[PDB]
């Protein structure tokens, strides 16, 4: 098998500051500072849960991919999960061979990623990232 | 970063996904993605059947309604194709946690016995950024 550990769960939030402060000051999580990533059109806050991370996303730019998501879910909502694969290239070829959204691109962690359409995943947008 | 950290929040225990078909969802993660998938476990006391997808560092729970009064039944009526439902974070002691939330004037959605036999509570997604968060005793 090529599948690995869950890298992160992504949450689109309508306010980055108040979302990060909730997990930090209400739930007592270890929370990072807001990191702007213009090449991906989001600002990210990393919530470290020990075994995995939570990514709080906020749009950065008008053509941001998650800008439309927050327009349908104005209060926020779960966006996608990220599972690691030992090799992104053999994975896509095994998925293409298995006749299974994204046309391989460098992800928000500097590693190549792809996104699977939620229809084939049970309703959840699944991002596969090179381990 | 080896900083001073005093907190009762723990590891992420699972991420829950409500699916319109348990069998076809479990088969996808097992046979398409190569994940370790459990057999369907019925939980009538909670009105769901659950399939556990073990990713090593955490688990994903694929939920399907079991009974007409299922709690995720309304979710699957709005999201017919499925969707992410909630996350579950462990706490070192559920009782000290709930009152620390009450002291912080945080109104909770739910203490009840959860799907793993341990006491749980649910926070309203408005205060969590849109995600339903379940706290369960570690
Ligand atoms: Co991501
Ligand atoms: Co749960």
């Amino acid at each position: 098998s090529m599948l690995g550990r869950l890298n992160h769960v992504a949450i689109a939030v309508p306010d980055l500051e108040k979302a990060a402060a909730f997990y930090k000051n209400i739930l007592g999580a270890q929370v990072s500072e807001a990191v702007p990533l213009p090449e991906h059109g989001v600002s990210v806050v990393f919530v470290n849960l020990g075994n995995t991370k939570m990514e709080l996303l906020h749009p950065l730019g008008l053509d941001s991919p998650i800008a439309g998501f927050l327009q349908k879910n104005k209060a926020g909502g779960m966006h996608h999960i990220c599972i690691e694969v030992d090799n992104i290239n053999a994975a896509v070829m095994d998925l293409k061979k298995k006749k299974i959204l994204s046309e391989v691109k460098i992800g928000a962690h500097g590693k190549p990623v792809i996104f699977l359409h939620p229809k084939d995943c049970g309703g959840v947008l699944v991002e596969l990232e090179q381990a």
Side-chain angles (χ1 to χ4, degrees), chain A residues 1-4 6-61 64-71 73-95 97-102 104 106-110 112-118 120-131:
Chain A
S1 174
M2 286 183 279
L3 214 52
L6 173 90
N7 185 275
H8 66 256
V9 181
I11 314 290
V13 298
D15 189 323
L16 199 37
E17 286 283 9
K18 302 172 184 165
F22 172 78
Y23 292 94
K24 184 193 191 123
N25 289 338
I26 305 291
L27 299 176
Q30 195 181 350
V31 173
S32 87
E33 282 277 29
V35 179
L37 302 174
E39 63 274 17
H40 309 291
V42 290
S43 299
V44 76
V45 153
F46 296 98
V47 178
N48 193 3
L49 301 175
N51 62 323
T52 191
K53 303 208 162 52
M54 281 182 47
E55 293 196 0
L56 314 173
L57 311 173
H58 190 71
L60 187 139
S64 172
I66 70 158
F69 183 89
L70 281 174
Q71 283 275 26
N73 317 75
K74 306 190 179 305
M78 302 159 86
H79 190 264
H80 74 259
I81 60 172
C82 186
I83 312 178
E84 301 175 20
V85 293
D86 44 26
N87 168 269
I88 176 58
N89 292 123
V92 200
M93 181 99 52
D94 167 38
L95 285 176
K97 172 187 299 128
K98 281 161 168 175
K99 316 298 300 192
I100 297 299
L101 160 83
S102 75
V104 182
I106 300 301
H109 305 80
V113 302
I114 48 141
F115 282 80
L116 302 174
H117 204 270
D120 304 333
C121 310
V124 47
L125 173 63
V126 171
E127 164 187 19
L128 293 177
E129 165 178 304
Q130 165 75 48

